[PDB]
Design brief:
- The structure is cut from a larger assembly and holds 2 copies of chain A.
- With 678 residues, chain A is an alpha/beta fold.
- Helix content of chain A is 46%, strand content 13%.
- Chain A has 25 helices and 18 strands.
- The radius of gyration of chain A is 30 Å and the shape is globular.
- The interface between A and B is large, with 39 and 44 residues.
- The complex binds phosphoaminophosphonic acid-adenylate ester (ANP), adenosine-5'-triphosphate, adenosine-5'-diphosphate and magnesium ion.
- Phosphoaminophosphonic acid-adenylate ester (ANP) binds next to helix 38 of chain B.
- Chain B: This is Cytoplasmic dynein 1 heavy chain 1.
- Chain B: Belongs to the dynein heavy chain family.
- Chain B: It comes from Homo sapiens.
């Protein structure tokens, strides 16, 4: 801490784009350290200060230990020739697994062409295909031919049968059996165990996505008259790229990972073809105005891509994208596909009209792609990496002690002891009375305290049993043994999850959130016992610390309705963000804390786009007012309030005013939102 | 097949002859086998193998011929593919008995429920729906000219389509006048609505609006003049005003449905026209008009299946003129408009449809509405344990061949094998459909085909398939590419409520909808989660329909009230000045509050006050029914209150029960045990008896005690004969009405736990069909007089399908206060003689007040005086109430229910007054004085309080309750410090006396030192036999619990055998014991005798009370639904005093039968807890271990007997006996079950 404070050149390191290459010397050493010692200390420092770069730092550690070219061979094109020739036996099938929507049979066809080997390819999609595959395999196993089976994940039981068959054969030396499938859990475990697995993924980037889309579409389809058609296809391709690459940056890019696959693209192409054939009626040219823009916008907003979208906010985002792209101004030479790329530069529409011009423009695109191409902020990348960074460490925690079995209970004893010490011993239950039951707030907090106390007893008993097992007092039961397996690896047990939480969370974060929630519950219970239910209005409740804050919002609405004798329908919500200490709450105003604002900064109760990942909102006053017939101002943006960073659950929506003349659409493209908890 | 139908001979003569010649040979072979059934004798029959191979070959050939013939008949008329094999055989075989065909049309046609026929059944004149709406054919189908079933059924389908098109033409021609008119005469509009069917009415309205808007948009034509669209909107609003005025009037049901459909369509038309005007659409080819569904009717087309064309964006469908009846229309929300748009886009692209979302979001109903809008037969396939696979290939072939839609509701719920097989079938069908879309394939000669059931089935283009899904998830990988998915996550509640409320004639609908919709979600969130609550959209729509009914009832009430006076009447004027919010809140309360738990009713009223401020629901006053309730309640010794009094909630609940019985034909009472649901129903029946002059009959059935086969009757697998079950017997008895049962009113009450297994057949009866179907093939129609009722402690194992069909009144435990039960007890004491038994039970009804019978017997006077002494302690804050509230805090091995303790206490007080009567009989010269009576009953009340409340607890907790009573009581208690109060008896004189005086010290023979089954008298034994006699005098079923070896079985046997009359039957229960054991025991010891009152079961020995010992009542295994069959059987016997002979299906009554059980505590592993409706009747005693004093006494007797062999060691008897006790007790203190499970000690050691 003192060294960090005294370092003048720390900030330039902390804001650097590649800090891992120049980590400062801060650790104290009694003796000079080895290169690997310096590497691990730099790894710890980068984890502490810049987790977004952790993976990069991790790579350096590998390069410090296993060689510079160690990881490089994977960063290359797959050389299936030598591997299948030498490292694969004839009876071992080559399982080519792909992520959904990606087909890898082209690689096998290319290899068969290169080696000059006859290959028989069969698609397994019906009962007939099983007979064809059996006949082809019986022929090739004797004659040593090559067999390929396409999309075998559709037949799990037949794959088990094929594995059993393969275990018994005596194949010819030149026989090879390729099985192309999509990554699904229904593939048999034994077949994966008894096969050579090759995982194929698409190369990330808008450029490769557009190239794949253009290659997949036949040339004659795009070349059909009128000449404007190709330009629309380019826009469509660009659109299909922008939504797809954005799925990498979820939950920021989209609320959830939708399956925007090639089927949507083919449906969109069919829609475009039908509408242009109807409008043009064979004319070699049609004006840009005559293009049915409304039909395309509505259909790809509701039918093609919007059908999969269930969140209203993602539907709004899709509407913004379609309205920005599909318009007559797309045919202007000055149109900008993505504005303020990297904050200074822009991407212009190609000025050509033929397919070849658009394909050349795509091929000539820069290789350096940032999130600003998709409308996201650049720091979205900095978010994604650190997520993957955590995804690294947690994964290694699942590897730390299933491989290693030497002492694990010696450390688990201390860990469970600390976890027991952190959690409070009890949660006092609220005293229901005749007077306070009329308060909706007391009902909500009583339900919360009941659930929290029950789950508290559950966790405390489980941890006590774990500590007893680590001391030898208690034997390892099946449930207990599973619990030690989860806790040692940092996995959250299923027995502990009874309120909505982020998926993939370790146990320390869960118990820390537990401690915060129980402390909040204790505080509100003490307030209720001391001052009755009347103090439940003046207490500042962190919506993150509640197991169902939507019930709290409804309870505040009901309390305002009861106090002011207004109908519940006639009440509407407004938000006031106050930085002043001691801001008095009106009779219809309720305090909240712990809110975080993703993608914006609030000054004077007005939003402004910011590059910060998240900003802590101060005491937020939720105020219920009679719904006045007020026109929706153009400078008003309706942000969501998601439960947590995963954005799986939406609590409610908040209308905020825009500080500057910024387009509200920029807030939708940026994915600005509010989180009850980080 | 060949003897069930007599017409099969004429259809298949050659196969009939071959089967005759085969049956003769097979019968001969089977006769030969029957004359020598040994396996080796059969094998050595000459040429048996070749003969059986020949028979197999020929039978296979005839079965193949029959299958080919039935497939030919199916293909001739493709709708038969929706019909099973036996049903198709019934249809063709009964070709000349057309009436038998009438039930099968609901499977083949969309709406045709029957065919109207000439009086001689030779010409078909039309079709009819379920609602009775009829379409009369323009050209009748002559069966005589087309005798074959398939031919005239095809002609019926053709004429249905032709006549529907020809009537749609006239309907459009007539409605064009209203389309172009500035004002619509209501009489002419109503006449037009009556003249034509609902389907054609809505289609005519849609066609007129679409053509008018098309002509308008053509006329504006780029000039920007919006006058024509304003004219269209004006006409639509005029029609809406006319319909709103007409729907407030009283209308027939069919015309009301037509008006509701027209309003629902015209609201959407008004919204669309307003949107077009706002958007300034100025060309017919703009997308804002093309994206709205449009109707183009071309009467000039000669073909009748390409006249109406329905268009939406790209898609250009034709209306298949399939009669749909009066279907339920859908409020065209923007979400349903999106669904229609996407689904029609998918159909135009030949893809399948997948509306996925949470449950109850309109997915399958929206798909059905879309299919019905285009006139195509939709066929929803449920996917929840009713998924008939064996017809599914046949159904798919039928859909492909005829042209018809198919929607899979919750396709996720199919299991993995089922999912994969159906996925493959739908994949093949979808590929066959997608083959249409290619342009190169010329359709002049294009016989598309699909591989189904190993045959090439032709696929029509009109067909489609839809797959509703529930996320949490994805579609199967086979069909992910072929199906377009749509997220129907959240329907528009507000607009649906708005349109429906406007359809019922409410002046204000926007505010009411915007209030009621958030209120339902508020109730869903705030109220405690219970299975029976249902705040989905179906409940909301039903509530709004009920609100409309209440509004119309109020209009008629005001109208008739004014008409009885001198006034001028107008329906609209009356409807103008009414509160709509009062009607809506009244409907909401009337529909919800009966289902509400007592904990949730004040929360619901708070929410209702919040959403509906300043509006309160005053309950409708039923003066006559309340007066009859008062009369019957005083007659039956029950409290009555006028609301917010002692017993107001119970009166309200019985009134709600009357309301639900009036509304529904099936209902349930789902309170906890001991809430007065059965008493409330009995009082209601006996009150309606007086009110309406209609005789009330009750048929109470315990469904779980009886097997399902006996309940519903079972078909004999051979030697075909039908044996009516009990429920079927009752239904047939009322239907026949031999004794005029139709005149009388009869209620069937299933007093037992509801389970899925025995309610499957009852689902058809409880549904709107009101039809019991049996495996015999008989269809019993429930008459209106029957009302199938249910009593359940809970509905934990009740299917939602059963709960939905039935109304419900939740009888929360705080409907019967302690004061009501105490008043019932004290009222029963003052007027029921306690010794006269059952002969004078009938005389209770002879006297309406029993004047001059105040001194019916000295027993009545004694028990009346006793009630007078006991009244101060039974008050609302008296000794008994405080004692019960304190006892509820104490833990008891068995669950402590209120009515169990109260019944135990009442039985003990009954025995107290019986003891006083005994003393009076034994002292005829001077009977009991009031001072001694006061002292005796005051002490007995405390004694009975202890032994009723803490009789289930340990000795320490009995002492605790004794201390509490000593604190709060005014009655003097024993003045000995270190003795518990329970150790003292109350003598016949008022003063206490220790139990130790009444236990003799006996000497046992050396012959039986360890097996004196006559129990050595000890303190616990004398206490427990005293209680045994007290609770056997009332015939209550005693039960005793305690740890193993405590001595309950011996004490029970000795006490029972001490009585002279009691005849003990020792039955031991096990995990496999059933009602059959008790029935067998009754057949052994007892016998059935017929009497004028009815069949009576009685012991063979005259003047002897047969008592059944059930040594382990707990041990019988529970079913999958947590109920012991034998326990329920015993419960119905002890509570109803009888049971139903299943073989005869008739009620029989026990006369001198009792039950007395023993148990171990339910904490032990092999045991189970007993039903709370059963534990209410039984008083449970806890026989703990004897302890040091009792053990010393018992084994002093045993060792004094044992040492008699050797006469020099008698002096060492007593010193030894202490040692045997002392060490034993020390072991019992040092080693416990916690250290090891088998460290258990008892007096058996
Ligand atoms: N007052 C008594 N006089 C004599 N023997 C007694 C007495 N009380 C208990 N016992 C003894 O206690 C033992 C248990 O007798 P028993 O009545 O069979 O217990 P139990 O509770 O019925 N066993 P179970 O029916 O399985 O619960 C026997 O050895 C009896 O002799
Ligand atoms: N209106 C009433 N006033 C006073 N006492 C009543 C009233 N209704 C019922 N009781 C008392 O409550 C007892 C239980 O009521 P009821 O016989 O209807 O049983 P139940 O609630 O259906 O219970 P179970 O689950 O045991 O069948 C009745 O025997 C009677 O003692
Ligand atoms: N848009 C709507 N208009 C009118 N009624 C609707 C609408 N959406 C849903 N409903 C009602 O809600 C119920 C939902 O049930 P259903 O559609 O059969 O299954 P699910 O909705 O669970 O797929 C239907 O009975 C229907 O009457
Ligand atoms: Mg009952």
């Amino acid at each position: 801490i003192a060294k960090v404070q005294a370092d003048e050149q720390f900030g330039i390191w902390l804001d650097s784009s590649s800090p891992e290459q120049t980590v400062p010397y801060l650790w104290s050493e009694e003796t000079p350290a080895t290169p690997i010692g310096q590497a691990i200390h730099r790894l710890l420092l980068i984890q502490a200060f810049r987790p977004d770069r952790l993976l990069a730092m991790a790579h350096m550690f590998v390069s410090t230990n296993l060689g510079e070219s160690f990881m490089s061979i994977m960063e290359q094109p797959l050389d299936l020739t030598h591997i299948v020739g030498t490292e694969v036996k004839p009876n071992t099938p080559v399982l080519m697994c792909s992520v959904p929507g990606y087909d890898a049979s082209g690689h096998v066809e290319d290899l068969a062409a290169e080696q000059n080997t006859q290959i028989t390819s069969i698609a397994i999609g019906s009962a007939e295909g099983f007979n064809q595959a059996d006949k082809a395999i019986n022929t090739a196993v004797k004659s040593g031919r090559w067999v390929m089976l396409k999309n075998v994940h559709l037949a799990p039981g037949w794959l088990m049968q094929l594995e059993k068959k393969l275990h018994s054969l005596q194949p010819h030396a030149c026989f090879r059996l390729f099985l192309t499938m999509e990554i699904n859990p229904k593939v048999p475990v034994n077949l994966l165990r008894a096969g050579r697995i090759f995982v194929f993924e698409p190369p990330p980037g808008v450029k490769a996505n557009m190239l794949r889309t253009f290659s997949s579409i036949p040339v004659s389809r795009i070349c059909k008259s009128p000449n404007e058609r190709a330009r629309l296809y380019f826009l469509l391709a660009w659109f299909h790229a922008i939504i797809q690459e954005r799925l990498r940056y979820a939950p920021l890019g989209w609320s959830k990972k939708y399956e925007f696959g090639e089927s949507d693209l083919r449906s969109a192409c069919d829609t475009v073809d039908t509408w242009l054939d109807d409008t043009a009626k064979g004319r070699q040219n049609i004006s840009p105005d005559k293009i049915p823009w409304s039909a395309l916008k509505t259909l790809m907003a509701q039918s093609i891509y919007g059908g999969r979208v269930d969140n209203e906010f993602d539907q709004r985002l899709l509407n913004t994208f379609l309205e920005r792209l599909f318009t007559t101004r797309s045919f202007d030479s000055e149109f900008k596909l993505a504005c303020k790329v990297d904050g200074h530069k822009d991407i212009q529409m190609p000025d050509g009209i033929r397919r070849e011009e658009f394909v050349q423009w795509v091929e000539l695109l820069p290789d350096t792609q940032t999130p600003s191409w998709l409308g996201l902020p650049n720091n979205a990348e900095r978010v994604l990496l650190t997520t993957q960074g955590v995804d690294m460490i947690s994964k290694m925690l699942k590897m730390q002690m299933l491989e290693d079995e030497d002492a694990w209970m010696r450390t688990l004893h201390t860990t469970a002891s600390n976890w027991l010490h952190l959690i409070p011993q009890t949660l006092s239950h609220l005293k229901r009375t005749v007077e306070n039951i009329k308060d909706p707030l007391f009902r909500f907090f009583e339900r919360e305290v009941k659930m929290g106390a029950k789950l508290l007893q559950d966790v405390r008993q489980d941890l006590a049993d774990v500590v007893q097992v680590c001391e030898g007092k208690k034997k390892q039961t099946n449930y207990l043994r599973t619990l030690i397996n989860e806790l040692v690896k940092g996995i959250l047990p299923r027995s502990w999850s009874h309120y909505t939480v982020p998926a993939g969370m370790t146990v320390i974060q869960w118990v820390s959130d537990f401690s915060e929630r129980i402390k909040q519950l204790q505080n509100i219970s003490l307030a209720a016992a001391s001052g009755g239910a009347k103090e439940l209005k003046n207490i500042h409740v962190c919506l993150g610390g509640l197991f169902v804050p939507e019930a709290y919002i409804t309870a505040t609405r009901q309390y305002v309705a009861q106090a002011n004798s207004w109908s519940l329908e006639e009440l509407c919500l407004e938000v006031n963000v106050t930085t002043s200490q001691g801001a008095t709450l009106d009779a219809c105003s309720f305090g909240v804390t712990g809110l975080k604002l993703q993608g914006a900064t609030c000054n004077n109760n007005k939003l402004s786009l910011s590059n910060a990942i998240s900003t802590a909102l101060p005491l937020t006053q939720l105020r219920w007012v009679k719904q006045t017939n007020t026109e929706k101002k153009a400078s008003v943006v309706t942000l969501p309030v998601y439960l947590n960073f995963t954005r799986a659950d939406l609590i409610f929506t908040v209308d905020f005013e825009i500080a500057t003349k910024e387009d509200p659409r920029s807030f939708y493209e940026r994915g600005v939102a509010v989180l009850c908890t980080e | 097949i060949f003897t069930g139908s007599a017409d099969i001979k004429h259809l298949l003569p050659v196969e009939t002859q071959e089967f005759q010649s085969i049956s003769t040979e097979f019968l001969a072979l089977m006769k030969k086998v029957s004359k020598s059934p040994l396996v080796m004798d059969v094998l050595n029959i000459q040429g048996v193998q070749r003969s059986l191979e020949r028979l197999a070959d020929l039978l296979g050939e005839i079965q193949k011929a029959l299958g080919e013939y039935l497939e030919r008949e199916r293909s001739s008329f493709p709708r038969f593919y929706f019909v099973g094999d036996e049903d198709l055989l019934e249809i063709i075989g009964n070709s000349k008995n057309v009436a038998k065909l009438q039930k099968h049309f609901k499977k083949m046609f969309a709406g045709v429920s029957s065919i109207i026929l000439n009086e001689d059944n030779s010409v078909v004149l039309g079709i009819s729906s379920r609602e009775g709406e009829e379409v009369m054919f323009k050209t009748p189908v002559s069966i005589t000219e087309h005798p074959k079933i398939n031919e005239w059924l095809t002609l019926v389908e053709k004429e249905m389509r032709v006549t529907l098109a020809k009537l749609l033409a006239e309907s459009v021609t007539e409605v064009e006048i209203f389309g172009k008119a500035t004002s619509i005469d209501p009489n002419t509009y109503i006449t037009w609505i009556d003249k034509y069917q609902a389907q054609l009415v809505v289609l005519s309205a849609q066609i007129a609006w679409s053509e008018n808007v098309e002509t308008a948009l053509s006329s504006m034509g780029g000039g920007g003049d919006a006058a024509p669209l304003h004219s269209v909107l004006s006409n639509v609003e005029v029609t809406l005003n006319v319909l709103a005025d007409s729907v407030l009037m009283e209308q027939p049901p069919l015309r009301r449905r037509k008006l509701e459909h027209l309003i629902t369509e015209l609201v959407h038309q008004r919204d669309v026209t307003r949107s077009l005007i706002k958007s300034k659409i100025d060309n017919a080819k703009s997308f804002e008009w093309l994206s709205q569904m449009r109707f183009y009717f071309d009467p000039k087309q000669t073909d009748v299946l390409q006249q109406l064309s329905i268009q939406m964006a790209n898609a250009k469908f034709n209306y298949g003129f399939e009669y749909l009846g009066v279907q339920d229309k859908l409020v065209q929300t923007p979400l349903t408009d999106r669904c229609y748009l996407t689904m029609t886009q998918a159909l135009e692209a030949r893809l399948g449809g997948s509306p996925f979302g949470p449950a109850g979001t309109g997915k399958t109903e929206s798909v059905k509405a879309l299919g019905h809008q285009l006139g195509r037969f939709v066929l929803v396939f449920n996917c929840d344990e009713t998924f008939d696979f064996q017809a599914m290939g046949r159904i798919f072939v039928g859909l492909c061949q005829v042209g018809a839609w198919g929607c899979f509701d919750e396709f996720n719920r199919l299991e993995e094998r089922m999912l994969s097989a159906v996925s493959q079938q739908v994949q093949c069908i979808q590929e066959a459909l997608r083959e249409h879309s290619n342009p190169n394939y010329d359709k002049t000669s294009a016989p598309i085909t699909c591989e189904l059931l190993n045959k090439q089935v032709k696929v029509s283009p009109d067909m489609a398939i839809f797959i509703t899904m529930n996320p949490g998830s994805n579609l199967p990988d086979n069909l992910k590419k072929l199906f377009r998915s749509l997220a129907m996550t959240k329907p528009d509640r507000q607009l649906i409520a708005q349109v429906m409320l406007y359809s019922q004639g409410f002046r204000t609908a926007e505010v009411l909808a915007n209030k009621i919709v958030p209120f339902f979600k508020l109730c869903d969130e705030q109220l405690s989660s219970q299975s029976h609550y249902d705040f989905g959209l179906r409940a909301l729509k039903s509530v709004l329909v009920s609100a409309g009914n209440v509004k119309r009832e109020r209009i008629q009430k005001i109208k008739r009230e004014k008409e009885e006076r001198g006034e001028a009447v107008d329906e609209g004027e009356i409807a103008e000045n009414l509160p709509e919010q009062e009607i809506l809140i009244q409907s909401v309360c009337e529909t919800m509050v009966p289902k509400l738990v007592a904990e949730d009713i004040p929360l619901l009223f708070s929410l209702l006050s919040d959403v509906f401020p300043g509006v309160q629901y005053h309950r409708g006053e039923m003066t006559a029914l309340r007066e009859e309730l008062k009369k019957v309640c005083q007659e039956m010794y029950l409290t009555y209150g006028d609301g917010e009094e002692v017993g107001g909630m119970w009166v309200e609940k019985v009134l709600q029960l009357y309301q639900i019985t009036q509304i529904n034909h099936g209902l349930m009472m789902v309170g906890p045990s001991g809430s007065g649901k059965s008493m409330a129903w009995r009082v209601l029946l006996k009150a309606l008896e007086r009110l309406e002059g209609v005789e009330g009959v009750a048929h109470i059935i315990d469904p779980k005690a009886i097997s399902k086969d006996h309940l519903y009757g079972t078909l004999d697998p051979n030697t075909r004969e039908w044996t009516d079950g009990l429920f079927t017997h009752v239904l047939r008895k009322i239907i026949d009405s031999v004794r005029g049962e139709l005149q009388k009113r009869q209620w069937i009450v299933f007093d037992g736990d509801v389970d899925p297994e025995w309610v499957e057949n009852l689902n058809s009866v409880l549904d709107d069909n009101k039809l019991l179907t049996l495996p015999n093939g008989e269809r019993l129609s429930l008459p209106p007089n029957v009302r199938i009722m249910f009593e359940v402690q809970d509905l934990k194992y009740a299917t939602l399908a059963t709960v939905s069909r039935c109304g419900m009144v939740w009888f929360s435990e705080d409907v019967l206060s302690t004061d009501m039960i105490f008043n019932n007890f004290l009222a029963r004491l003052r007027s029921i003689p306690l010794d006269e038994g059952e002969d004078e039970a009938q005389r209770r009804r002879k006297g309406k007040e029993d004047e001059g019978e105040e001194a019916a017997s000295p027993m009545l006077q004694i028990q009346r005086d006793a009630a007078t002494i006991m009244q101060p302690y039974f008050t609302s804050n008296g000794l008994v109430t405080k004692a019960l509230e304190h006892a509820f805090q104490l833990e008891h091995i068995m669950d402590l229910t209120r009515l169990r303790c109260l019944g135990s206490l009442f039985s003990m007080l009954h025995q107290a007054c019986r003891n006083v009567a005994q003393y009076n009989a034994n002292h005829p010269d001077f009977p009991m004085q009031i001072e001694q009576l006061e002292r005796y009953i005051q002490r007995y009340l405390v004694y009975a309080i202890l032994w009723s409340l803490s009789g289930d607890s340990r000795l320490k907790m009995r002492a605790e309750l004794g201390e509490y009573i000593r604190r709060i009581t005014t009655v003097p208690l024993p003045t000995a410090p270190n003795i518990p109060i329970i150790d003292y008896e109350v003598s016949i004189s008022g003063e206490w006396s220790p139990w130790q005086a009444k236990v003799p010290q006996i000497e046992v023979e050396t012959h039986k030192v360890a097996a004196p089954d006559v129990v050595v008298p000890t303190l616990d034994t004398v206490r427990h036999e005293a209680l045994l006699y007290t609770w056997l005098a009332e015939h209550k079923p005693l039960v005793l619990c305690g740890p193993p070896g405590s001595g309950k079985t011996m004490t029970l046997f000795s006490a029972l055998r001490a009585l002279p009359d009691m005849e003990v039957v020792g039955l031991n229960f096990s995990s496999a014991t059933t009602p059959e054991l008790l029935l067998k025991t009754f057949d052994h010891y007892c016998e059935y005798r017929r009497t004028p009152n009815g069949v009576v079961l009685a012991p063979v020995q005259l003047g002897k009370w047969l008592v059944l010992f059930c040594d382990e009542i707990n041990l019988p295994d529970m079913d999958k639904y947590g109920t012991q069959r034998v326990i329920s059987f015993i419960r119905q016997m002890v509570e109803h005093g009888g049971f139903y002979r299943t073989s005869d299906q008739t009620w029989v009554k026990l006369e001198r039968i009792q039950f007395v059980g023993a148990c171990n505590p339910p904490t032990d592993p092999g045991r189970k807890p007993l039903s709370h409706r059963f534990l209410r009747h039984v008083p449970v005693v806890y026989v703990d271990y004897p302890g040091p004093a009792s053990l010393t006494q018992i084994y002093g007797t045993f060792n004094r007997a044992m040492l008699r062999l050797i006469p020099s060691l008698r002096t060492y008897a007593e010193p030894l006996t202490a040692a045997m006790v002392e060490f034993y007790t020390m072991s019992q203190e040092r080693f416990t079950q916690d250290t090891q499970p088998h460290y258990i000690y008892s007096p058996r050691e």
